[PDB]
C-alpha cells in the first residue's frame, strides 16, 4: 500500500493503492476557486448574469436559464411564450453540445480520440448558431431574467433545421465506433457500479440516477418553461455502470434532437422579453423617442431593477444533472446571497465510493462517466 | 414516458450462440469499426486554409472596442458613464469636464482589455451608439501594456474600422 499524488480541467488526486487495486481515493479541489459567489454580491442581477456562463462552461445557456428562472420567480413575472420556446430550443442545443463534449472526451481519455474530431465539427456548427444569435461563440449571455436579449435573425431557424436533420447519422457513426466495440465494453461494463439507494443518499442527480434505474427527470416531473408541451422519452439504465450511462447519454442526444424538431415546428410569434420596462429594457427607438423609456433605460442600466425580498431555490435539469441556485434578495438591486448547487460537486464527492475495488486505470473512466467540469465544482 | 437502454436478452438458440462465437473469434465488430474509419478517410476534410480563409461571423459579433463619431466629425460620447456603471468587470474608467466650447466630452476614457469580458453590455447601454464592440478579433499583443486602451487608441480604432462597424450596425440595429 503506497500513496500516489496525481497532481496537475485541473484536478489533484491522492490515492492509496495496494497493488493495482484502488484502496482509497481522495480528490483535492479548489484549484479553480475564483470566488464567484462572493463577487456576485457586489454586482447587480444583470451584472451577475455573465458569471453563470463561466460556471459550467460546456452548457452555458442552461446556467443562464436556471439563473433567469430564479430571478423571475423572485420578481413574480413570466417571460413571453416565444421567449420560452427560444429558451427551450437553445437549452436542447446546449444539451447536445454538452453530451458531445462529455462522451467524446470520455472516449479520448479511454483512448479512442477519433469521434472527438468527428463531433467537434458539429460542435463548431452549434457554436456558429450561438454566435449568430448573440455575437459570442460560447458565453452568449443571451438568456436574461426577463426573456432573451434579442430576437432570432431571419435565417436562423432554417439553418438549425438543416443542421439537425443530419445529426442522427453523426450519432450513428459515434455508436458504430463505440457501442459494440469489445474494448469499449470491457473498459466501461461493470465499472463504477452505483446502487439506487446509494445514488439517492449521496446526492446524485441526472444520468447518475437514471443509470441505476431511478425514474426521475426534472423536465418531466417539474417542467419549467415549455417542457410539458414537448414530448420526449427518458432513457433509463439497468446496471448502474459506465456503459449504461454511456447509453443513456447517447439516447439523450437522440431525444434532444426530437425536442429540437418539435421546438422548430411550434415556434410562436410575438415579443422576446417581458413587456415591463421596469424589469426589461425598452427598445432603442423607444428609448430615443420616449421620456419614460429613456428614464427606464438609464435607471435599468445604472442601478438595475429591485427584486422583492425573499429566498428561493430554483433547479433545472441541466445536462450534467440538477443545476440549482439558492438566491437571497434583500429588496435592493444587488443579490444578498447567491449559492450555486452544481451536480459535479456531489458526483466528485461520490467518486471515492464509486472507485472502490477497481484498477488505477478505472479511476479515469469513472471521472469521465461522472462528467466533471471543475468550473462548477469549484466555483 | 421512459425507455430501456440495456434491457436486452441474448437469444440462446444454437444459431445465435454460433453468431456470438464467430464474432468473438473472427472480430467482426472490430472489422466493422475499421470500415467506418476507412470510409471516413475517403471524404473531404473540414479544414479551412487560414489565414487565407476565414471562419464565418455575424453582424452581432463582439470584438475590439471602438469609439464612434457623427458624420460631421464630432465624437458621439457625452460622458453619461452608463457603460462604466454597467460594466460587469469594471474595465472602463471615465473622466469628463466641460470642453472649450461648453460641450460635455470626456477627458479620460480607458478600457482595460485584460479585464474586459466582451459581454457587449457597454454598447447596449450607450444611448448615442458611441462605444461599440467592433468586428476585429485579430489584435493579439506582445506586451501586457498595449492591452490597456486609452481614449486615443479607441478613437483611432473607431476611425480605422468605421466603415464595417457602420455597415454591421445598419444590418443589425432593427433587432435592438
Amino acid at each position: 500500500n503506497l500513496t500516489l499524488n496525481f497532481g496537475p480541467g485541473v484536478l489533484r488526486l491522492v490515492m492509496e493503492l495496494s497493488g493495482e487495486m484502488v484502496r482509497k481515493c481522495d480528490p483535492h479541489i479548489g484549484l479553480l476557486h475564483r470566488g464567484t459567489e462572493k463577487l456576485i454580491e457586489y454586482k447587480t442581477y444583470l451584472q451577475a448574469l455573465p458569471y453563470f456562463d463561466r460556471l459550467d462552461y460546456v452548457s452555458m445557456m442552461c446556467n443562464e436559464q436556471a439563473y433567469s428562472l430564479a430571478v423571475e420567480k423572485l420578481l413574480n413575472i413570466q417571460p413571453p411564450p416565444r421567449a420560452q420556446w427560444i429558451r427551450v430550443l437553445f437549452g436542447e442545443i446546449t444539451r447536445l453540445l454538452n453530451h458531445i463534449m462529455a462522451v467524446t472526451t470520455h472516449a479520448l481519455d479511454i483512448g479512442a480520440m477519433t469521434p472527438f474530431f468527428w463531433m467537434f465539427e458539429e460542435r463548431e456548427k452549434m457554436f456558429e448558431f450561438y454566435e449568430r444569435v448573440s455575437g459570442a461563440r460560447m458565453h452568449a449571455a443571451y438568456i436574461r431574467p426577463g426573456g432573451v436579449h434579442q430576437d432570432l435573425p431571419l435565417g436562423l431557424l432554417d439553418d438549425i433545421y438543416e443542421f439537425s436533420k443530419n445529426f442522427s447519422f453523426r450519432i450513428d457513426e459515434l455508436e458504430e465506433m463505440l457501442t459494440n466495440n469489445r474494448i469499449w465494453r470491457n473498459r466501461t461494463v461493470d465499472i463504477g457500479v452505483v446502487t439506487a439507494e446509494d445514488a439517492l443518499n449521496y446526492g446524485f442527480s441526472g444520468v447518475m440516477l437514471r443509470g441505476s434505474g431511478i425514474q426521475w427527470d426534472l423536465r418531466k416531473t417539474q417542467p419549467y418553461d415549455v417542457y410539458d408541451q414537448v414530448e420526449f422519452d427518458v432513457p433509463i439504465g439497468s446496471r448502474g455502470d459506465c456503459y449504461d450511462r454511456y447509453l443513456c447519454r447517447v439516447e439523450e442526444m437522440r431525444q434532444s434532437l426530437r425536442i429540437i424538431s418539435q421546438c422548430l415546428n411550434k415556434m410562436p410569434p410575438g415579443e422576446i422579453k417581458v413587456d415591463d420596462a421596469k424589469v426589461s429594457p425598452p427598445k432603442r427607438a423607444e428609448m430615443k423617442t420616449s421620456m419614460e423609456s429613456l428614464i427606464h433605460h438609464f435607471k435599468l442600466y445604472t442601478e438595475g431593477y429591485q427584486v422583492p425580498p425573499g429566498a428561493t431555490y430554483t433547479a433545472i435539469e441541466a445536462p450534467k444533472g440538477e443545476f440549482g441556485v439558492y438566491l437571497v434578495s434583500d429588496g435592493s438591486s444587488r443579490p444578498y446571497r447567491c449559492k450555486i448547487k452544481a451536480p459535479g460537486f456531489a458526483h466528485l464527492a461520490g467518486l471515492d465510493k464509486m472507485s472502490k475495488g477497481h484498477m488505477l486505470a478505472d479511476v479515469v473512466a469513472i471521472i469521465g462517466t461522472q462528467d466533471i467540469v471543475f468550473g462548477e465544482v469549484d466555483r | 414516458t421512459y425507455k430501456f437502454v440495456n434491457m436486452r436478452e441474448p437469444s440462446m438458440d444454437m444459431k445465435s450462440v454460433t453468431d456470438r462465437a464467430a464474432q468473438t473469434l473472427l472480430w467482426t465488430e472490430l472489422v466493422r469499426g475499421l470500415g467506418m474509419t476507412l470510409s471516413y478517410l475517403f471524404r473531404e476534410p473540414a479544414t479551412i486554409n487560414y489565414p487565407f480563409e476565414k471562419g464565418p461571423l455575424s453582424p452581432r459579433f463582439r470584438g475590439e472596442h471602438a469609439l464612434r463619431r457623427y458624420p460631421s466629425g464630432e465624437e458621439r460620447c457625452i460622458a453619461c458613464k452608463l457603460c462604466e456603471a454597467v460594466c460587469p468587470a469594471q474595465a472602463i474608467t471615465i473622466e469628463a469636464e466641460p470642453r472649450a466650447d461648453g460641450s460635455r466630452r470626456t477627458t479620460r476614457y480607458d478600457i482595460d482589455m485584460t479585464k474586459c469580458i466582451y459581454c457587449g453590455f457597454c454598447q447596449e447601454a450607450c444611448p448615442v451608439d458611441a462605444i461599440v464592440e467592433g468586428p476585429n478579433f485579430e489584435f493579439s499583443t506582445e506586451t501586457h501594456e498595449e492591452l490597456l486602451y486609452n481614449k486615443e487608441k479607441l478613437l483611432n480604432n473607431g476611425d480605422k474600422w468605421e466603415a464595417e462597424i457602420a455597415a454591421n450596425i445598419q444590418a443589425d440595429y432593427l433587432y435592438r
Binding site: 431557424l157 458504430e176 415546428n265 | -
Partner: peptide
Amino acid sequence: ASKVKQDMPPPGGYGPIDYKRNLPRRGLS
C-alpha cells in the same frame, strides 16, 4: 404599411427529422 416580419417556421412546418438509432446489420451467419 408594412406588416410583421420575424423568424418563423415556413407554412406547413419543416420536414421530419430522423432521430432513431440506425445501425444496419451487414449480414452473414
